[PDB]
Amino acid sequence: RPGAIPTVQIDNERVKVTEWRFPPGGETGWHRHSMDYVVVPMTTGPLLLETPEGSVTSQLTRGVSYTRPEGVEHNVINPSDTEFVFVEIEIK
């Protein structure tokens, strides 16, 4: 797949904030989250998450934030024909 593009916006003693910009069909690659994190979606739409429990399609809504814990392990894919963006705030 094409690669999603992470841009780190903030990396201080308290948080690391990364913008993830997905081209259509783009993926993060598999990773494991080492920190609790908050997601602020900048786009409304579905994401495809490959997870240890299998494939999960999730609905994100622009401007509706949510949090997930340290230990989440997955590959995130943009299953749409448009760009998808979200901001991820990892708590240190």
Q: Around 37, how many Cα atoms within 13 Å sit in the side-chain half-sphere? A: 20
Which residues in the 53-92 window bind a copy of itself by CB under 8 A? 62-67, 85, 87, 89, 91
d(CA 77, CA 23): 10
The size of the chain, in residues, is: 92
Residue 44 interacts with a copy of itself (CB under 8 A)?
Answer: no
Q: Give yes or no for a contact between 20 and 5, defined as CB atoms under 8 angstroms apart.
A: yes
Residue closer to a copy of itself (CB basis): 55 or 68:
68
Q: Please give the residue ranges that form the binding site for a copy of itself (CB under 8 A).
A: 9-10, 12, 14-15, 17, 19, 36, 38, 40, 42, 62-67, 85, 87, 89, 91
